[PDB]
Inverse folding.
């Protein structure tokens, strides 16, 4: 059996290609059903009645975690998402550009000629913007990275194991307790921020209870930084592999959003996602029973030649983007933060090119280590300044 790990990208991609070819719907040794083709991934994600986002159905003795937007289906999903949806509109998000650019430019200006992109910018920018979105203070950013890292590196094998779900609860316990305390504070003294908005909202004619609002806040915080960090790293790493694009972008900065969409397609931060079948069903003629877990490979769908011509060629001129960006999901759970992620990464890339022209990855620096699981990225990305304002006579 054995799915290759995320850390060896080449091995993983090769394995996905063979599966698209020879076993596009595959049951693994844990009874988890993997879906590899673009068209079938779209089918699964669109059909929420059959493919629930709630994992707890197949986790022995588990009950739903209340307030977890990413685990709730229609008709309940609409009402929860409506609580926060206006916080994320393009017009509202666009107002954040000056703040994002200020943070990015200040962070980059203090970097030497050799630095870890992750510690300098990719982590601090997204954690700052999400903390600010939630009304949280800067002193707490380090806790956020520690808690995220613990979750991302949680010991995991079988994803239906109730011991995993329990372990996840334990790891998030401090973060959730912290946010519950902040929810309580906002009920007593509300602000413009997202936590205030969520604690004062009505869903089904009643406020979210304390547990629901703390869990909802925990999901918002985690969603708001981890993948943005991963993508910005993947952007520079991917440009480094296709560096003719550094000059094309310097010459025409209006190319950057297209570069971002294409890096998303090429290296999705979150390469797979899970659903659970609510009834006996079928994917591409393959019978799947009721009450099992299904794993959709966004990464495999994005490299599927039936969907993308020459799929392993990095090509910003491809027409794909907007709501068709599968790396943000598809259908009802399509990423709420998508405009915000696109803006943060656009600004980051503009400022990188503004200051440095290009960054070269130092591929032999031992801090360059890929994540082993869950996300598709590197924990650090040691880089070297192409040029910078620091260079003298
Ligand atoms: C709200 C939208 C985000 O959801 C989460 O962050 C939620 C809160 C996480 O949920 C946790 C908490 C929980 C109690 O709800 C639990 O039931 C599930 C299994 O794990 C994500 C689904 C979680 O993913 C899950 O982590 C588990 C430890 C393992 C699981 N599978 C690989 C089995 C993975 O999906 C990550 C690590 O936050 C993913 C991030 C990095 C994204 O990239 C995603 C793009 C991520 O940012 C979004 C999916
Ligand atoms: C490049 C960076 C990002 C990527 C790749 C990404 C990816 C995704 C994906 C694939 C989903 C759907 C999960 C599913 O269908 O099960 C999702 C959902 C979500 N994302 Fe993002 N995300 C990014 C940034 C953000 C940011 C900055 C925010 C702001 C908080 C955010 C908030 C959310 C929320 C609230 C959901 C759940 C939506 C719902 O279930 O209705 N995301 N994200």
């Amino acid at each position: 059996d054995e799915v290759p790990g995320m850390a060896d990208e080449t091995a993983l991609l090769d394995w996905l290609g063979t599966m698209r070819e020879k076993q596009p719907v595959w049951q693994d040794r844990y009874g988890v059903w993997h879906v590899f083709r673009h068209a079938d991934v779209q089918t699964v994600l669109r059909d929420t009645a059959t493919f629930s986002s709630d994992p707890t159905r197949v986790i022995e003795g588990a009950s739903p975690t209340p307030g977890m937007i990413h685990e709730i289906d229609p008709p309940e999903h609409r009402a929860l998402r409506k609580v926060v949806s206006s916080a994320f509109t393009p017009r509202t998000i666009s107002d954040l550009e000056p703040r994002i650019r200020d943070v990015t430019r200040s962070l980059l200006a203090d970097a030497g000629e050799s630095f870890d992109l992750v510690d300098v910018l990719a982590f601090p920018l997204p954690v700052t913007i999400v903390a600010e979105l939630l009304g949280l203070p800067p002193m707490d950013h380090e806790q956020f990275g520690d808690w995220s890292g613990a979750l991302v590196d949680i010991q995991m094998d079988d994803p239906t194991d109730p011991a995993l779900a329990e372990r996840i609860a334990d790891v998030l316990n401090p973060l959730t307790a912290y946010l519950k305390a902040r929810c309580a504070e906002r009920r007593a003294d509300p602000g413009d921020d997202l936590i205030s908005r969520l604690v004062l909202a009505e869903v089904d004619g009643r406020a979210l209870d304390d547990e629901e609002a703390a869990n909802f806040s925990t999901a918002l915080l985690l969603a708001g930084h981890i993948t943005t960090t991963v993508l910005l790293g993947n952007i520079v790493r991917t440009l480094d592999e296709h560096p003719a694009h550094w000059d094309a972008a310097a010459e025409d900065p209006g190319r950057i959003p297209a570069i971002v969409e294409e890096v998303l397609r090429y290296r999705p931060p979150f390469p797979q996602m899970q659903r659970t079948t609510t009834k006996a069903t079928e994917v591409a003629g393959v019978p799947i029973p009721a009450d099992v877990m299904v794993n959709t490979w966004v990464l495999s769908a994005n490299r599927d030649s039936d969907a993308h011509d020459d799929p392993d060629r990095f090509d910003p001129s491809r027409k794909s983007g907007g709501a068709a960006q599968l790396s943000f999901g598809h259908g009802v759970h399509f990423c709420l933060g998508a405009p915000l992620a696109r803006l943060e990464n656009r600004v980051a890339l503009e400022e990188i090119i503004a200051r440095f022209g290009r960054l070269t990855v130092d591929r032999d620096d031992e801090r360059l280590r890929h994540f082993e699981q869950i996300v598709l990225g590197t924990r650090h990305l040691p880089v070297l300044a192409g040029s910078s304002p620091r260079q003298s006579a």
Observations:
- Residues 55, 65, 68-71, 151-152, 154, 156, 159, 168, 219, 222-223, 226-227, 269-270, 274, 374-375 surround Erythromycin D (ligand 1) (CB under 6 Å).
- The two ends are 59 Å apart (CA to CA).
- The longest helix spans residues 210-241.
- The chain is about 50% helix and 10% strand.
